[PDB]
């Protein structure tokens, strides 16, 4: 509360460490459905159904331009990418499986780097 603070957690490396995680997600072999924004002209249903599209390249631009106020807002966009994927793709599809694999990969790196 006013003039009463928990001890200051060192967040000075968060930007660099989120960049490294995002590099590792970018270079994963199952990243291909997620590298670029879904083409809203060419994919029927996507625009109407997925209210907040997100992809790795859009995260990378947000990261590089100081549009994440903290590491939690960064994790929210990464998870959004996988939540969108599960909303639109059957579990038993290449893209559906890709999304599950990447979410697992992400969540481990997140825990190991920060928890």
PDB file of N, CA and C in Angstrom:
ATOM      1  N   UNK A   1       0.900  -1.199   0.000  1.00  0.00           N
ATOM      2  CA  UNK A   1       0.000   0.000   0.000  1.00  0.00           C
ATOM      3  C   UNK A   1       0.910   1.213   0.000  1.00  0.00           C
ATOM      4  N   UNK A   2       0.357   2.418   0.234  1.00  0.00           N
ATOM      5  CA  UNK A   2       1.178   3.655   0.335  1.00  0.00           C
ATOM      6  C   UNK A   2       2.362   3.588   1.272  1.00  0.00           C
ATOM      7  N   UNK A   3       3.588   3.769   0.707  1.00  0.00           N
ATOM      8  CA  UNK A   3       4.833   3.695   1.488  1.00  0.00           C
ATOM      9  C   UNK A   3       5.123   2.266   2.114  1.00  0.00           C
ATOM     10  N   UNK A   4       4.501   1.260   1.551  1.00  0.00           N
ATOM     11  CA  UNK A   4       4.671  -0.167   2.012  1.00  0.00           C
ATOM     12  C   UNK A   4       4.831  -1.036   0.807  1.00  0.00           C
ATOM     13  N   UNK A   5       6.087  -1.432   0.543  1.00  0.00           N
ATOM     14  CA  UNK A   5       6.389  -2.241  -0.650  1.00  0.00           C
ATOM     15  C   UNK A   5       7.093  -3.521  -0.366  1.00  0.00           C
ATOM     16  N   UNK A   6       6.681  -4.622  -1.018  1.00  0.00           N
ATOM     17  CA  UNK A   6       7.504  -5.850  -1.109  1.00  0.00           C
ATOM     18  C   UNK A   6       8.884  -5.522  -1.641  1.00  0.00           C
ATOM     19  N   UNK A   7       9.884  -6.343  -1.301  1.00  0.00           N
ATOM     20  CA  UNK A   7      11.238  -6.152  -1.854  1.00  0.00           C
ATOM     21  C   UNK A   7      11.286  -6.146  -3.429  1.00  0.00           C
ATOM     22  N   UNK A   8      12.128  -5.247  -3.999  1.00  0.00           N
ATOM     23  CA  UNK A   8      12.181  -5.037  -5.478  1.00  0.00           C
ATOM     24  C   UNK A   8      12.838  -6.250  -6.224  1.00  0.00           C
ATOM     25  N   UNK A   9      12.013  -7.169  -6.770  1.00  0.00           N
ATOM     26  CA  UNK A   9      12.418  -8.139  -7.840  1.00  0.00           C
ATOM     27  C   UNK A   9      13.139  -7.480  -9.053  1.00  0.00           C
ATOM     28  N   UNK A  10      14.313  -8.019  -9.388  1.00  0.00           N
ATOM     29  CA  UNK A  10      15.172  -7.405 -10.415  1.00  0.00           C
ATOM     30  C   UNK A  10      14.558  -7.781 -11.779  1.00  0.00           C
ATOM     31  N   UNK A  11      14.032  -6.782 -12.463  1.00  0.00           N
ATOM     32  CA  UNK A  11      13.375  -6.977 -13.775  1.00  0.00           C
ATOM     33  C   UNK A  11      14.208  -6.415 -14.928  1.00  0.00           C
ATOM     34  N   UNK A  12      15.440  -5.985 -14.644  1.00  0.00           N
ATOM     35  CA  UNK A  12      16.297  -5.304 -15.641  1.00  0.00           C
ATOM     36  C   UNK A  12      16.739  -6.177 -16.861  1.00  0.00           C
ATOM     37  N   UNK A  13      16.751  -7.479 -16.660  1.00  0.00           N
ATOM     38  CA  UNK A  13      17.023  -8.487 -17.687  1.00  0.00           C
ATOM     39  C   UNK A  13      15.789  -9.107 -18.403  1.00  0.00           C
ATOM     40  N   UNK A  14      14.614  -8.682 -18.012  1.00  0.00           N
ATOM     41  CA  UNK A  14      13.378  -9.331 -18.550  1.00  0.00           C
ATOM     42  C   UNK A  14      13.303  -9.189 -20.095  1.00  0.00           C
ATOM     43  N   UNK A  15      13.541  -7.983 -20.589  1.00  0.00           N
ATOM     44  CA  UNK A  15      13.478  -7.676 -22.042  1.00  0.00           C
ATOM     45  C   UNK A  15      14.375  -8.604 -22.847  1.00  0.00           C
ATOM     46  N   UNK A  16      15.627  -8.727 -22.431  1.00  0.00           N
ATOM     47  CA  UNK A  16      16.571  -9.617 -23.036  1.00  0.00           C
ATOM     48  C   UNK A  16      16.186 -11.056 -22.947  1.00  0.00           C
ATOM     49  N   UNK A  17      15.727 -11.477 -21.788  1.00  0.00           N
ATOM     50  CA  UNK A  17      15.347 -12.859 -21.634  1.00  0.00           C
ATOM     51  C   UNK A  17      14.023 -13.230 -22.458  1.00  0.00           C
ATOM     52  N   UNK A  18      13.054 -12.315 -22.477  1.00  0.00           N
ATOM     53  CA  UNK A  18      11.823 -12.566 -23.344  1.00  0.00           C
ATOM     54  C   UNK A  18      12.245 -12.674 -24.836  1.00  0.00           C
ATOM     55  N   UNK A  19      13.200 -11.810 -25.260  1.00  0.00           N
ATOM     56  CA  UNK A  19      13.764 -11.866 -26.644  1.00  0.00           C
ATOM     57  C   UNK A  19      14.403 -13.225 -26.937  1.00  0.00           C
ATOM     58  N   UNK A  20      15.132 -13.790 -25.980  1.00  0.00           N
ATOM     59  CA  UNK A  20      15.740 -15.062 -26.153  1.00  0.00           C
ATOM     60  C   UNK A  20      14.741 -16.183 -26.239  1.00  0.00           C
ATOM     61  N   UNK A  21      13.762 -16.197 -25.347  1.00  0.00           N
ATOM     62  CA  UNK A  21      12.666 -17.143 -25.464  1.00  0.00           C
ATOM     63  C   UNK A  21      11.990 -17.071 -26.871  1.00  0.00           C
ATOM     64  N   UNK A  22      11.727 -15.868 -27.326  1.00  0.00           N
ATOM     65  CA  UNK A  22      10.957 -15.638 -28.530  1.00  0.00           C
ATOM     66  C   UNK A  22      11.818 -16.146 -29.696  1.00  0.00           C
ATOM     67  N   UNK A  23      13.166 -15.923 -29.639  1.00  0.00           N
ATOM     68  CA  UNK A  23      14.095 -16.507 -30.644  1.00  0.00           C
ATOM     69  C   UNK A  23      14.009 -18.020 -30.704  1.00  0.00           C
ATOM     70  N   UNK A  24      13.937 -18.694 -29.569  1.00  0.00           N
ATOM     71  CA  UNK A  24      13.880 -20.109 -29.499  1.00  0.00           C
ATOM     72  C   UNK A  24      12.527 -20.608 -30.055  1.00  0.00           C
ATOM     73  N   UNK A  25      11.452 -19.858 -29.807  1.00  0.00           N
ATOM     74  CA  UNK A  25      10.131 -20.216 -30.390  1.00  0.00           C
ATOM     75  C   UNK A  25      10.157 -20.022 -31.926  1.00  0.00           C
ATOM     76  N   UNK A  26      10.712 -18.910 -32.404  1.00  0.00           N
ATOM     77  CA  UNK A  26      10.880 -18.632 -33.820  1.00  0.00           C
ATOM     78  C   UNK A  26      11.642 -19.717 -34.597  1.00  0.00           C
ATOM     79  N   UNK A  27      12.614 -20.356 -33.978  1.00  0.00           N
ATOM     80  CA  UNK A  27      13.482 -21.297 -34.653  1.00  0.00           C
ATOM     81  C   UNK A  27      13.047 -22.745 -34.424  1.00  0.00           C
ATOM     82  N   UNK A  28      12.023 -23.016 -33.629  1.00  0.00           N
ATOM     83  CA  UNK A  28      11.478 -24.359 -33.477  1.00  0.00           C
ATOM     84  C   UNK A  28      10.889 -24.844 -34.817  1.00  0.00           C
ATOM     85  N   UNK A  29      11.099 -26.117 -35.106  1.00  0.00           N
ATOM     86  CA  UNK A  29      10.597 -26.638 -36.358  1.00  0.00           C
ATOM     87  C   UNK A  29       9.073 -26.594 -36.507  1.00  0.00           C
ATOM     88  N   UNK A  30       8.305 -26.617 -35.422  1.00  0.00           N
ATOM     89  CA  UNK A  30       6.881 -26.508 -35.451  1.00  0.00           C
ATOM     90  C   UNK A  30       6.308 -25.057 -35.354  1.00  0.00           C
ATOM     91  N   UNK A  31       7.144 -24.080 -35.536  1.00  0.00           N
ATOM     92  CA  UNK A  31       6.758 -22.690 -35.447  1.00  0.00           C
ATOM     93  C   UNK A  31       6.002 -22.207 -36.700  1.00  0.00           C
ATOM     94  N   UNK A  32       6.142 -22.943 -37.833  1.00  0.00           N
ATOM     95  CA  UNK A  32       5.666 -22.446 -39.152  1.00  0.00           C
ATOM     96  C   UNK A  32       4.217 -21.942 -39.187  1.00  0.00           C
ATOM     97  N   UNK A  33       3.251 -22.528 -38.412  1.00  0.00           N
ATOM     98  CA  UNK A  33       1.898 -21.903 -38.455  1.00  0.00           C
ATOM     99  C   UNK A  33       1.739 -20.538 -37.810  1.00  0.00           C
ATOM    100  N   UNK A  34       2.801 -20.119 -37.071  1.00  0.00           N
ATOM    101  CA  UNK A  34       2.749 -19.017 -36.096  1.00  0.00           C
ATOM    102  C   UNK A  34       3.708 -17.877 -36.443  1.00  0.00           C
ATOM    103  N   UNK A  35       4.492 -17.996 -37.496  1.00  0.00           N
ATOM    104  CA  UNK A  35       5.570 -17.035 -37.798  1.00  0.00           C
ATOM    105  C   UNK A  35       5.039 -15.680 -38.262  1.00  0.00           C
ATOM    106  N   UNK A  36       3.928 -15.727 -38.993  1.00  0.00           N
ATOM    107  CA  UNK A  36       3.345 -14.551 -39.627  1.00  0.00           C
ATOM    108  C   UNK A  36       1.882 -14.454 -39.316  1.00  0.00           C
ATOM    109  N   UNK A  37       1.282 -13.257 -39.424  1.00  0.00           N
ATOM    110  CA  UNK A  37      -0.150 -13.163 -39.224  1.00  0.00           C
ATOM    111  C   UNK A  37      -0.957 -14.021 -40.242  1.00  0.00           C
ATOM    112  N   UNK A  38      -2.038 -14.600 -39.762  1.00  0.00           N
ATOM    113  CA  UNK A  38      -2.956 -15.397 -40.603  1.00  0.00           C
ATOM    114  C   UNK A  38      -3.514 -14.420 -41.626  1.00  0.00           C
ATOM    115  N   UNK A  39      -3.558 -14.838 -42.904  1.00  0.00           N
ATOM    116  CA  UNK A  39      -3.979 -13.910 -43.997  1.00  0.00           C
ATOM    117  C   UNK A  39      -5.536 -13.861 -43.981  1.00  0.00           C
ATOM    118  N   UNK A  40      -6.048 -12.759 -43.477  1.00  0.00           N
ATOM    119  CA  UNK A  40      -7.479 -12.577 -43.262  1.00  0.00           C
ATOM    120  C   UNK A  40      -8.289 -12.482 -44.538  1.00  0.00           C
ATOM    121  N   UNK A  41      -7.634 -12.172 -45.658  1.00  0.00           N
ATOM    122  CA  UNK A  41      -8.291 -12.223 -46.979  1.00  0.00           C
ATOM    123  C   UNK A  41      -8.419 -13.640 -47.463  1.00  0.00           C
ATOM    124  N   UNK A  42      -7.471 -14.515 -47.129  1.00  0.00           N
ATOM    125  CA  UNK A  42      -7.417 -15.830 -47.741  1.00  0.00           C
ATOM    126  C   UNK A  42      -7.866 -16.953 -46.880  1.00  0.00           C
ATOM    127  N   UNK A  43      -8.225 -16.693 -45.617  1.00  0.00           N
ATOM    128  CA  UNK A  43      -8.643 -17.783 -44.717  1.00  0.00           C
ATOM    129  C   UNK A  43     -10.017 -17.486 -44.240  1.00  0.00           C
ATOM    130  N   UNK A  44     -10.994 -18.087 -44.946  1.00  0.00           N
ATOM    131  CA  UNK A  44     -12.381 -17.947 -44.525  1.00  0.00           C
ATOM    132  C   UNK A  44     -12.639 -18.232 -43.055  1.00  0.00           C
ATOM    133  N   UNK A  45     -13.409 -17.364 -42.461  1.00  0.00           N
ATOM    134  CA  UNK A  45     -13.864 -17.517 -41.082  1.00  0.00           C
ATOM    135  C   UNK A  45     -12.947 -16.871 -40.044  1.00  0.00           C
ATOM    136  N   UNK A  46     -11.680 -16.675 -40.426  1.00  0.00           N
ATOM    137  CA  UNK A  46     -10.675 -16.246 -39.372  1.00  0.00           C
ATOM    138  C   UNK A  46     -10.946 -14.914 -38.773  1.00  0.00           C
ATOM    139  N   UNK A  47     -11.263 -13.955 -39.663  1.00  0.00           N
ATOM    140  CA  UNK A  47     -11.492 -12.586 -39.242  1.00  0.00           C
ATOM    141  C   UNK A  47     -12.643 -12.479 -38.244  1.00  0.00           C
ATOM    142  N   UNK A  48     -13.753 -13.138 -38.565  1.00  0.00           N
ATOM    143  CA  UNK A  48     -14.934 -13.079 -37.679  1.00  0.00           C
ATOM    144  C   UNK A  48     -14.796 -13.846 -36.399  1.00  0.00           C
ATOM    145  N   UNK A  49     -14.171 -14.999 -36.498  1.00  0.00           N
ATOM    146  CA  UNK A  49     -14.122 -15.860 -35.353  1.00  0.00           C
ATOM    147  C   UNK A  49     -13.034 -15.461 -34.344  1.00  0.00           C
ATOM    148  N   UNK A  50     -11.889 -15.021 -34.851  1.00  0.00           N
ATOM    149  CA  UNK A  50     -10.690 -14.822 -33.924  1.00  0.00           C
ATOM    150  C   UNK A  50     -10.583 -13.361 -33.649  1.00  0.00           C
ATOM    151  N   UNK A  51     -11.023 -12.974 -32.474  1.00  0.00           N
ATOM    152  CA  UNK A  51     -11.247 -11.564 -32.247  1.00  0.00           C
ATOM    153  C   UNK A  51      -9.898 -10.801 -32.104  1.00  0.00           C
ATOM    154  N   UNK A  52      -8.876 -11.501 -31.612  1.00  0.00           N
ATOM    155  CA  UNK A  52      -7.583 -10.896 -31.431  1.00  0.00           C
ATOM    156  C   UNK A  52      -6.459 -11.736 -32.016  1.00  0.00           C
ATOM    157  N   UNK A  53      -6.179 -11.585 -33.303  1.00  0.00           N
ATOM    158  CA  UNK A  53      -5.136 -12.379 -33.944  1.00  0.00           C
ATOM    159  C   UNK A  53      -3.802 -12.026 -33.333  1.00  0.00           C
ATOM    160  N   UNK A  54      -2.941 -13.041 -33.200  1.00  0.00           N
ATOM    161  CA  UNK A  54      -1.552 -12.803 -32.704  1.00  0.00           C
ATOM    162  C   UNK A  54      -0.635 -13.827 -33.374  1.00  0.00           C
ATOM    163  N   UNK A  55       0.619 -13.456 -33.566  1.00  0.00           N
ATOM    164  CA  UNK A  55       1.611 -14.295 -34.217  1.00  0.00           C
ATOM    165  C   UNK A  55       2.999 -13.863 -33.716  1.00  0.00           C
ATOM    166  N   UNK A  56       4.025 -14.697 -33.991  1.00  0.00           N
ATOM    167  CA  UNK A  56       5.372 -14.410 -33.459  1.00  0.00           C
ATOM    168  C   UNK A  56       5.951 -13.132 -33.985  1.00  0.00           C
ATOM    169  N   UNK A  57       5.734 -12.814 -35.279  1.00  0.00           N
ATOM    170  CA  UNK A  57       6.325 -11.595 -35.882  1.00  0.00           C
ATOM    171  C   UNK A  57       5.750 -10.291 -35.280  1.00  0.00           C
ATOM    172  N   UNK A  58       4.480 -10.316 -34.911  1.00  0.00           N
ATOM    173  CA  UNK A  58       3.754  -9.258 -34.288  1.00  0.00           C
ATOM    174  C   UNK A  58       4.243  -9.105 -32.832  1.00  0.00           C
ATOM    175  N   UNK A  59       4.477 -10.223 -32.171  1.00  0.00           N
ATOM    176  CA  UNK A  59       5.092 -10.180 -30.833  1.00  0.00           C
ATOM    177  C   UNK A  59       6.489  -9.588 -30.928  1.00  0.00           C
ATOM    178  N   UNK A  60       7.287 -10.026 -31.911  1.00  0.00           N
ATOM    179  CA  UNK A  60       8.636  -9.516 -32.051  1.00  0.00           C
ATOM    180  C   UNK A  60       8.651  -7.984 -32.277  1.00  0.00           C
ATOM    181  N   UNK A  61       7.757  -7.476 -33.084  1.00  0.00           N
ATOM    182  CA  UNK A  61       7.676  -6.040 -33.318  1.00  0.00           C
ATOM    183  C   UNK A  61       7.219  -5.255 -32.038  1.00  0.00           C
ATOM    184  N   UNK A  62       6.221  -5.788 -31.331  1.00  0.00           N
ATOM    185  CA  UNK A  62       5.773  -5.206 -30.076  1.00  0.00           C
ATOM    186  C   UNK A  62       6.950  -5.171 -29.038  1.00  0.00           C
ATOM    187  N   UNK A  63       7.680  -6.265 -28.948  1.00  0.00           N
ATOM    188  CA  UNK A  63       8.791  -6.388 -28.034  1.00  0.00           C
ATOM    189  C   UNK A  63       9.895  -5.342 -28.338  1.00  0.00           C
ATOM    190  N   UNK A  64      10.311  -5.314 -29.598  1.00  0.00           N
ATOM    191  CA  UNK A  64      11.323  -4.412 -30.060  1.00  0.00           C
ATOM    192  C   UNK A  64      10.992  -2.925 -29.943  1.00  0.00           C
ATOM    193  N   UNK A  65       9.748  -2.535 -29.773  1.00  0.00           N
ATOM    194  CA  UNK A  65       9.301  -1.150 -29.841  1.00  0.00           C
ATOM    195  C   UNK A  65       8.705  -0.716 -28.507  1.00  0.00           C
ATOM    196  N   UNK A  66       8.994  -1.487 -27.438  1.00  0.00           N
ATOM    197  CA  UNK A  66       8.512  -1.139 -26.084  1.00  0.00           C
ATOM    198  C   UNK A  66       7.085  -1.065 -25.866  1.00  0.00           C
ATOM    199  N   UNK A  67       6.363  -1.981 -26.515  1.00  0.00           N
ATOM    200  CA  UNK A  67       4.928  -2.058 -26.312  1.00  0.00           C
ATOM    201  C   UNK A  67       4.472  -3.115 -25.272  1.00  0.00           C
ATOM    202  N   UNK A  68       5.418  -3.888 -24.742  1.00  0.00           N
ATOM    203  CA  UNK A  68       5.123  -4.681 -23.524  1.00  0.00           C
ATOM    204  C   UNK A  68       5.548  -3.949 -22.210  1.00  0.00           C
ATOM    205  N   UNK A  69       4.560  -3.596 -21.392  1.00  0.00           N
ATOM    206  CA  UNK A  69       4.938  -2.935 -20.141  1.00  0.00           C
ATOM    207  C   UNK A  69       5.620  -3.852 -19.176  1.00  0.00           C
ATOM    208  N   UNK A  70       5.372  -5.173 -19.230  1.00  0.00           N
ATOM    209  CA  UNK A  70       6.051  -6.047 -18.304  1.00  0.00           C
ATOM    210  C   UNK A  70       6.058  -7.485 -18.872  1.00  0.00           C
ATOM    211  N   UNK A  71       6.782  -8.390 -18.208  1.00  0.00           N
ATOM    212  CA  UNK A  71       6.909  -9.762 -18.772  1.00  0.00           C
ATOM    213  C   UNK A  71       5.529 -10.504 -18.796  1.00  0.00           C
ATOM    214  N   UNK A  72       4.559 -10.176 -17.935  1.00  0.00           N
ATOM    215  CA  UNK A  72       3.266 -10.843 -17.996  1.00  0.00           C
ATOM    216  C   UNK A  72       2.445 -10.505 -19.262  1.00  0.00           C
ATOM    217  N   UNK A  73       2.551  -9.262 -19.737  1.00  0.00           N
ATOM    218  CA  UNK A  73       1.832  -8.879 -20.928  1.00  0.00           C
ATOM    219  C   UNK A  73       2.467  -9.611 -22.110  1.00  0.00           C
ATOM    220  N   UNK A  74       3.764  -9.900 -22.063  1.00  0.00           N
ATOM    221  CA  UNK A  74       4.446 -10.647 -23.125  1.00  0.00           C
ATOM    222  C   UNK A  74       3.900 -12.098 -23.147  1.00  0.00           C
ATOM    223  N   UNK A  75       3.838 -12.725 -21.968  1.00  0.00           N
ATOM    224  CA  UNK A  75       3.323 -14.155 -21.877  1.00  0.00           C
ATOM    225  C   UNK A  75       1.853 -14.232 -22.332  1.00  0.00           C
ATOM    226  N   UNK A  76       1.074 -13.189 -22.078  1.00  0.00           N
ATOM    227  CA  UNK A  76      -0.343 -13.175 -22.478  1.00  0.00           C
ATOM    228  C   UNK A  76      -0.468 -13.253 -24.037  1.00  0.00           C
ATOM    229  N   UNK A  77       0.352 -12.487 -24.745  1.00  0.00           N
ATOM    230  CA  UNK A  77       0.361 -12.546 -26.220  1.00  0.00           C
ATOM    231  C   UNK A  77       0.871 -13.884 -26.762  1.00  0.00           C
ATOM    232  N   UNK A  78       1.913 -14.488 -26.151  1.00  0.00           N
ATOM    233  CA  UNK A  78       2.382 -15.767 -26.585  1.00  0.00           C
ATOM    234  C   UNK A  78       1.214 -16.771 -26.418  1.00  0.00           C
ATOM    235  N   UNK A  79       0.580 -16.766 -25.235  1.00  0.00           N
ATOM    236  CA  UNK A  79      -0.499 -17.751 -24.969  1.00  0.00           C
ATOM    237  C   UNK A  79      -1.677 -17.523 -25.912  1.00  0.00           C
ATOM    238  N   UNK A  80      -1.957 -16.262 -26.265  1.00  0.00           N
ATOM    239  CA  UNK A  80      -2.987 -15.889 -27.222  1.00  0.00           C
ATOM    240  C   UNK A  80      -2.790 -16.572 -28.541  1.00  0.00           C
ATOM    241  N   UNK A  81      -1.528 -16.691 -28.983  1.00  0.00           N
ATOM    242  CA  UNK A  81      -1.214 -17.343 -30.217  1.00  0.00           C
ATOM    243  C   UNK A  81      -1.736 -18.822 -30.137  1.00  0.00           C
ATOM    244  N   UNK A  82      -1.490 -19.476 -29.007  1.00  0.00           N
ATOM    245  CA  UNK A  82      -1.905 -20.876 -28.895  1.00  0.00           C
ATOM    246  C   UNK A  82      -3.366 -21.118 -28.639  1.00  0.00           C
ATOM    247  N   UNK A  83      -3.982 -20.240 -27.866  1.00  0.00           N
ATOM    248  CA  UNK A  83      -5.413 -20.186 -27.696  1.00  0.00           C
ATOM    249  C   UNK A  83      -6.161 -19.945 -28.957  1.00  0.00           C
ATOM    250  N   UNK A  84      -5.700 -19.004 -29.761  1.00  0.00           N
ATOM    251  CA  UNK A  84      -6.273 -18.840 -31.133  1.00  0.00           C
ATOM    252  C   UNK A  84      -6.174 -20.098 -31.958  1.00  0.00           C
ATOM    253  N   UNK A  85      -5.003 -20.717 -31.931  1.00  0.00           N
ATOM    254  CA  UNK A  85      -4.774 -21.935 -32.714  1.00  0.00           C
ATOM    255  C   UNK A  85      -5.770 -23.059 -32.301  1.00  0.00           C
ATOM    256  N   UNK A  86      -5.979 -23.213 -30.999  1.00  0.00           N
ATOM    257  CA  UNK A  86      -6.922 -24.260 -30.504  1.00  0.00           C
ATOM    258  C   UNK A  86      -8.367 -23.918 -30.866  1.00  0.00           C
ATOM    259  N   UNK A  87      -8.716 -22.638 -30.860  1.00  0.00           N
ATOM    260  CA  UNK A  87     -10.062 -22.196 -31.290  1.00  0.00           C
ATOM    261  C   UNK A  87     -10.409 -22.566 -32.784  1.00  0.00           C
ATOM    262  N   UNK A  88      -9.440 -22.481 -33.648  1.00  0.00           N
ATOM    263  CA  UNK A  88      -9.624 -22.631 -35.083  1.00  0.00           C
ATOM    264  C   UNK A  88      -9.231 -23.966 -35.686  1.00  0.00           C
ATOM    265  N   UNK A  89      -8.449 -24.784 -34.963  1.00  0.00           N
ATOM    266  CA  UNK A  89      -7.832 -25.959 -35.586  1.00  0.00           C
ATOM    267  C   UNK A  89      -8.201 -27.194 -34.752  1.00  0.00           C
ATOM    268  N   UNK A  90      -8.520 -28.260 -35.468  1.00  0.00           N
ATOM    269  CA  UNK A  90      -8.753 -29.522 -34.787  1.00  0.00           C
ATOM    270  C   UNK A  90      -7.439 -29.969 -34.080  1.00  0.00           C
ATOM    271  N   UNK A  91      -7.578 -30.512 -32.864  1.00  0.00           N
ATOM    272  CA  UNK A  91      -6.433 -31.208 -32.147  1.00  0.00           C
ATOM    273  C   UNK A  91      -5.691 -32.229 -33.051  1.00  0.00           C
ATOM    274  N   UNK A  92      -6.441 -33.003 -33.845  1.00  0.00           N
ATOM    275  CA  UNK A  92      -5.872 -33.992 -34.744  1.00  0.00           C
ATOM    276  C   UNK A  92      -5.651 -33.400 -36.162  1.00  0.00           C
ATOM    277  N   UNK A  93      -4.731 -32.449 -36.239  1.00  0.00           N
ATOM    278  CA  UNK A  93      -4.294 -31.810 -37.498  1.00  0.00           C
ATOM    279  C   UNK A  93      -2.858 -31.444 -37.301  1.00  0.00           C
ATOM    280  N   UNK A  94      -2.121 -31.201 -38.360  1.00  0.00           N
ATOM    281  CA  UNK A  94      -0.745 -30.814 -38.193  1.00  0.00           C
ATOM    282  C   UNK A  94      -0.675 -29.494 -37.382  1.00  0.00           C
ATOM    283  N   UNK A  95      -1.545 -28.541 -37.695  1.00  0.00           N
ATOM    284  CA  UNK A  95      -1.429 -27.203 -37.061  1.00  0.00           C
ATOM    285  C   UNK A  95      -1.862 -27.321 -35.619  1.00  0.00           C
ATOM    286  N   UNK A  96      -2.887 -28.156 -35.363  1.00  0.00           N
ATOM    287  CA  UNK A  96      -3.446 -28.351 -34.012  1.00  0.00           C
ATOM    288  C   UNK A  96      -2.329 -28.951 -33.114  1.00  0.00           C
ATOM    289  N   UNK A  97      -1.614 -29.947 -33.627  1.00  0.00           N
ATOM    290  CA  UNK A  97      -0.534 -30.584 -32.906  1.00  0.00           C
ATOM    291  C   UNK A  97       0.654 -29.629 -32.682  1.00  0.00           C
ATOM    292  N   UNK A  98       0.969 -28.858 -33.725  1.00  0.00           N
ATOM    293  CA  UNK A  98       1.997 -27.804 -33.663  1.00  0.00           C
ATOM    294  C   UNK A  98       1.715 -26.897 -32.482  1.00  0.00           C
ATOM    295  N   UNK A  99       0.468 -26.460 -32.352  1.00  0.00           N
ATOM    296  CA  UNK A  99       0.122 -25.519 -31.297  1.00  0.00           C
ATOM    297  C   UNK A  99       0.269 -26.067 -29.918  1.00  0.00           C
ATOM    298  N   UNK A 100      -0.128 -27.329 -29.764  1.00  0.00           N
ATOM    299  CA  UNK A 100       0.084 -27.968 -28.460  1.00  0.00           C
ATOM    300  C   UNK A 100       1.519 -28.112 -28.143  1.00  0.00           C
ATOM    301  N   UNK A 101       2.366 -28.532 -29.120  1.00  0.00           N
ATOM    302  CA  UNK A 101       3.789 -28.706 -28.915  1.00  0.00           C
ATOM    303  C   UNK A 101       4.477 -27.382 -28.520  1.00  0.00           C
ATOM    304  N   UNK A 102       4.131 -26.321 -29.251  1.00  0.00           N
ATOM    305  CA  UNK A 102       4.744 -25.007 -28.990  1.00  0.00           C
ATOM    306  C   UNK A 102       4.347 -24.448 -27.621  1.00  0.00           C
ATOM    307  N   UNK A 103       3.143 -24.654 -27.219  1.00  0.00           N
ATOM    308  CA  UNK A 103       2.668 -24.165 -25.917  1.00  0.00           C
ATOM    309  C   UNK A 103       3.463 -24.851 -24.787  1.00  0.00           C
ATOM    310  N   UNK A 104       3.530 -26.183 -24.873  1.00  0.00           N
ATOM    311  CA  UNK A 104       4.462 -26.935 -23.990  1.00  0.00           C
ATOM    312  C   UNK A 104       5.886 -26.444 -23.948  1.00  0.00           C
ATOM    313  N   UNK A 105       6.542 -26.257 -25.108  1.00  0.00           N
ATOM    314  CA  UNK A 105       7.838 -25.740 -25.222  1.00  0.00           C
ATOM    315  C   UNK A 105       7.981 -24.372 -24.550  1.00  0.00           C
ATOM    316  N   UNK A 106       7.006 -23.482 -24.806  1.00  0.00           N
ATOM    317  CA  UNK A 106       7.010 -22.147 -24.239  1.00  0.00           C
ATOM    318  C   UNK A 106       6.924 -22.175 -22.684  1.00  0.00           C
ATOM    319  N   UNK A 107       6.020 -22.991 -22.157  1.00  0.00           N
ATOM    320  CA  UNK A 107       5.660 -22.948 -20.770  1.00  0.00           C
ATOM    321  C   UNK A 107       6.845 -23.473 -19.935  1.00  0.00           C
ATOM    322  N   UNK A 108       7.589 -24.444 -20.482  1.00  0.00           N
ATOM    323  CA  UNK A 108       8.803 -24.895 -19.817  1.00  0.00           C
ATOM    324  C   UNK A 108       9.875 -23.815 -19.778  1.00  0.00           C
ATOM    325  N   UNK A 109      10.138 -23.157 -20.910  1.00  0.00           N
ATOM    326  CA  UNK A 109      11.124 -22.105 -20.943  1.00  0.00           C
ATOM    327  C   UNK A 109      10.757 -20.983 -20.013  1.00  0.00           C
ATOM    328  N   UNK A 110       9.463 -20.701 -19.922  1.00  0.00           N
ATOM    329  CA  UNK A 110       8.964 -19.619 -19.080  1.00  0.00           C
ATOM    330  C   UNK A 110       9.231 -19.908 -17.555  1.00  0.00           C
ATOM    331  N   UNK A 111       8.851 -21.088 -17.120  1.00  0.00           N
ATOM    332  CA  UNK A 111       9.094 -21.607 -15.784  1.00  0.00           C
ATOM    333  C   UNK A 111      10.586 -21.659 -15.479  1.00  0.00           C
ATOM    334  N   UNK A 112      11.397 -22.243 -16.364  1.00  0.00           N
ATOM    335  CA  UNK A 112      12.811 -22.331 -16.105  1.00  0.00           C
ATOM    336  C   UNK A 112      13.515 -20.998 -16.071  1.00  0.00           C
ATOM    337  N   UNK A 113      13.065 -20.012 -16.859  1.00  0.00           N
ATOM    338  CA  UNK A 113      13.737 -18.727 -16.888  1.00  0.00           C
ATOM    339  C   UNK A 113      13.329 -17.813 -15.715  1.00  0.00           C
ATOM    340  N   UNK A 114      12.073 -17.880 -15.285  1.00  0.00           N
ATOM    341  CA  UNK A 114      11.454 -16.884 -14.416  1.00  0.00           C
ATOM    342  C   UNK A 114      10.877 -17.410 -13.068  1.00  0.00           C
ATOM    343  N   UNK A 115      10.498 -18.687 -12.937  1.00  0.00           N
ATOM    344  CA  UNK A 115       9.906 -19.232 -11.677  1.00  0.00           C
ATOM    345  C   UNK A 115      10.906 -20.066 -10.841  1.00  0.00           C
TER     346      UNK A 115
END
